[PDB]
Structures are given as structure tokens and as C-alpha cells.
Design a binder for these strands. Structure first.
Ligand SMILES: [Ca+2]
Ligand SMILES: [Ca+2]
Ligand SMILES: [Cl-]
Length: 54
DNA sequence: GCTTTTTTTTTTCACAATCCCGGTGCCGAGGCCGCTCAATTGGTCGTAGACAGCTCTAGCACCGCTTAAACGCACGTACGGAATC
């Protein structure tokens, strides 16, 4: 148990910050609990809507 | 049909404005540096919700009368809408 480094954005194959998105969900008063996929799905959508506009 | 006009459309140009080009200069996009704080890891601990099994609500199908409501036509009158000053 000392095996560190990887980011969730990298796991999901994304550019947008999954971790940040997660925190933002958690800190936003949206729901008491937040699934582990919730931010991944969301971030990916924001990536796509961002990419489409650009 | 006449002639004799006034209008509309064509042709013609002048001219005004906007578009295109190469050149110059500034500053903010862009990328890097060096520090830090927030994302990550691995722990623990508890309950949310996924599940299975059961109750009984209420949503659907159907039937068969009774009108109120939709339909389809005749009829003419006011309306929408062109033209003109
Ligand atoms: Ca329950
Ligand atoms: Ca059930
Ligand atoms: Cl999830």
C-alpha cells in the first residue's frame, strides 16, 4: 500500500478534470451522495459540448 | 386606327464607398518556471438502494343507450386587400 499517481481524467480517457468535476458536484448542494461515474459521465459531456463549439 | 404625351425601363457615365493589398509596431496569447493546494491513495465503517416477493390500486377493455355536439350544406354580408391620391 504505497502505489500512487494516476488521475481519473486519464482513466476515463478524457481532457476535462473528472476529479474537479467530482468535487464541484460534491460541494454544490446537488445531492447528499455522488456516484463514482457521475463526474466521469458529466466531464465527458462538457468535453464534447466544448469540443463541438470549438 | 390616329397623333401626342407622360411614364418605365435602358443605357450611360461619374463618383462614392467599400474591398483588397503590403508594411509597421505593439501587447497579449502562449508557454514556461517554481511553489502549493487540492486530487489521489488506501484505510475504515454504515446505509442506500438493488432485489425478490407480495398486496391490491387503478388503468384498461368492453358494452349499450341517450343526447349534446360535429358535420355539411345554403346564403349573403361584412371583411381583407388591392388601387389611388
Ligand atoms: Ca427499503
Ligand atoms: Ca416489483
Ligand atoms: Cl455512478
Amino acid at each position: 500500500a504505497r502505489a500512487k499517481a494516476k488521475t481519473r481524467s486519464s482513466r476515463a480517457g478524457l481532457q476535462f478534470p473528472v476529479g474537479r468535476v467530482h468535487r464541484l458536484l460534491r460541494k454544490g448542494n446537488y445531492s447528499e451522495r455522488v456516484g463514482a461515474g457521475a463526474p466521469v459521465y458529466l466531464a465527458a459531456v462538457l468535453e464534447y459540448l466544448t469540443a463541438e463549439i470549438l
